[PDB]
Every structure is written in C-alpha cells, then in structure tokens.
C-alpha cells in the first residue's frame, strides 16, 4: 500500500503493526515510527503511549 499511517508523516514500507490498543488515536504504524522488530509478542502498541493509553483504560 502507499499512504501515510504513523505519525512519522509516512506508511507502511514493509514491518507493520496496527495499534492493539482499544483506545490508540490510529491502527496503523511503521517500525521506523516507533520502536520494534517483527512486533514483539505478535502484538505490539502503536506507540510507547499506544502502549499506556491502553493501560489507562479497561479495568483501571
Ligand atoms: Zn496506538
Ligand atoms: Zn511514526
């Protein structure tokens, strides 16, 4: 695909991973937008905050 996903203004060139967050502002990031590799666990959270958000919602 070529569009834009990532808040890094660009999209997916190949490692993807949607944010598996419930809340997660996007569902779409690169790993050259974030920070990981084949994303870790199978899922990964779009963002360090991706990552939080989640926390902070659902079950405290
Ligand atoms: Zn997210
Ligand atoms: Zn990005």
Request: charged share 25%.
């Amino acid at each position: 695909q070529e569009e834009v996903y990532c808040f890094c203004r660009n999209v997916s060139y190949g490692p993807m991973v949607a944010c598996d967050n419930p809340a997660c502002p996007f569902e779409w990031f690169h790993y050259g937008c974030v920070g990981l590799k084949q994303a870790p666990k199978g899922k990964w959270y779009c963002s360090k905050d991706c990552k939080e958000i989640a926390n902070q919602r659902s079950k405290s």
